Subunit: 215 residues, 3 copies
Amino acid sequence: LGLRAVLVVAGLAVLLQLIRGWLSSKSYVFNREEIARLAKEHSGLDYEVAFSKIIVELRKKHPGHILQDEDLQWVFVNAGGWMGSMCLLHASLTEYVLLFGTAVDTGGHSGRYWAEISDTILSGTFRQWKEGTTKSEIFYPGDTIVHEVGEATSVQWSSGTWMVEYGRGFIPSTLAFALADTIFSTQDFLTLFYTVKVYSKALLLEASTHLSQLG
Amino acid sequence: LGLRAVLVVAGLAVLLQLIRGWLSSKSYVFNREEIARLAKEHSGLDYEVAFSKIIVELRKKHPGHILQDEDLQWVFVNAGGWMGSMCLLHASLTEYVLLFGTAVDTGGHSGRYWAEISDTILSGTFRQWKEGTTKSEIFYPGDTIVHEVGEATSVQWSSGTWMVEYGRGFIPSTLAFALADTIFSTQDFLTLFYTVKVYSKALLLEASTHLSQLG
Amino acid sequence: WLGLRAVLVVAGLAVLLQLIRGWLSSKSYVFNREEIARLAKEHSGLDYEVAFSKIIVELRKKHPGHILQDEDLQWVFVNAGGWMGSMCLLHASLTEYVLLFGTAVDTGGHSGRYWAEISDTILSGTFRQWKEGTTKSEIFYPGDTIVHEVGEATSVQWSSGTWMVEYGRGFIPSTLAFALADTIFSTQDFLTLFYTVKVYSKALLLEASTHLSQLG
Ligand SMILES: O=C(OCCN1CCOCC1)C1(c2ccccc2)CCCCC1
Ligand SMILES: O=C(OCCN1CCOCC1)C1(c2ccccc2)CCCCC1
Ligand SMILES: O=C(OCCN1CCOCC1)C1(c2ccccc2)CCCCC1
Ligand SMILES: CCCCCCCCO[C@@H]1O[C@H](CO)[C@@H](O)[C@H](O)[C@H]1O
């Protein structure tokens, strides 16, 4: 009838306005400024000591929203042509906090999702190459890169680069990316299992905490 | 004697020989020596100044075969395990001219297609590792690398490496490669959309110029 | 009982794994990790090509009929786990393989995770290994030997011109997927895939014909 297609894009737009109003009106456990300031506070000492102190601070300020020491493990992350490792501390459907970094020189595509991802370097260097330009920037400990919603860059990390990462938005929209290189390159399905496990642990902790505070 | 198998073999051989004869007896808008000399002439300037001057020269010598300024945009190129960026100026089924390069350190497979691809460096370095050897060669501004037909090499580019590229042959035979990393790694389908858009704009410009000559 | 069928599948997989593991534990092998490691470190002070030739000659002398001749040796590109190198296969069976590996460009990525132990003795260059579960990597130089253990997955990195002698023992088919992924979902270099299939078929047929010659 020459009209049906306008109704499908209108239904997707209704869904998008619904989700956008929800994400703009929702309450969040953390904010990117809090995580960025906490990470920049310990940017002067060793990155492992910084990891420990930031974990302690996050468990103190937000009890029931951070995994315990028995649930912390380093999991390899192969995505977008790069390879690093993560230690997940918090994860819901709209938020995640983790410690990211690499001990090797890597780089590739940063991904493009419906979420905002901030990274505060604890040690090393962080080269970001934004879209549409011919020049990149290097960020140092204390600085923070804000991978905006819907924008795609090229990331490059030198050996020994470690940072604290906070993401807010629609978290599932990232999942595919985080697994792509594992499905079509590394074939390390044990790491896939580890990732699914730690994500499930964080989600279950968050759900049980929501159950407890309601009653 | 199996008849359908022999017929398939003979038909595919006749099709390949037909395409080969058409490529051997076809007229072309550019040649690799033209693009290479034009790029080497301006290789001593800043690569952005060189970009401007090379675009102006290409539009002067070949009017109606280069996209206008409102249609030029930098689109990411993830392929063969490396990540760079392109600005497509011309593209047909048998030719393409573009500005390629990266602002990060990358490298990977060069691909292996039925087309000859020449790259003249305006800035940076270009490490080529030919097939069947244990040593590579570094190339500097002014040099021209010819990725030959059916040949596969290893490419590596340092941060800030920019070059002018001309490809001639059966251009569609590259498409799969050019999209592989996008489908199974980056999942950046908006960059895929940009690539499809610019390639379609170039093909439409070429068909429009073909129509303008006849009437 | 649907649980009966799933338990049957689990028990069958378990008995097959146990059968293959017992066979690997009770099998005789042509080479060992220490042999290849010491032989490569012996020539690790020369240029990597002179070392290549000397190691090939010594290996063909000590184990005749188990290593390809000069007419079957060729360099084949190897894209895997996000890194790109080159290999020259000298020996390969279902449980063993010996080859020369290395890269002329700076590369790195996932090391893979298979049911086989893979040793690499550096003849030239540098080898950065990043073990799983740690936040620090380690660089190894010519003369050193890296042991990619069974079931472990690391991050590998090699600088331009790094060359080594590789020996793998275990269930070699368990590597096939990792060896082909980048070719299927990235490089599309099916001619390099053909070359890989060709050299491995040559090696397998060499092993089979050598075993037939022993019996008659
Ligand atoms: O842990 C990650 O990767 C950080 C690396 N950074 C690099 C810079 O760009 C953003 C991602 C991601 C994750 C993995 C698993 C659970 C939750 C999140 C976060 C989104 C990006 C890929 C996967
Ligand atoms: O834009 C590109 O990439 C140049 C980079 N070069 C670097 C040297 O080796 C060949 C590729 C390609 C393209 C393909 C199709 C349309 C428009 C552009 C050209 C072929 C290689 C990948 C895709
Ligand atoms: O020949 C290879 O490539 C060695 C590369 N090495 C480098 C050091 O780390 C381990 C892998 C492999 C292969 C290629 C082709 C067919 C069957 C196997 C052997 C298993 C490990 C990867 C792929
Ligand atoms: C990636 C971690 C740092 C590696 C050493 C880089 C030293 C400076 O490198 C420079 O960085 C600039 C911004 O990216 C670019 O303009 C230059 O092309 C690049 O040479």
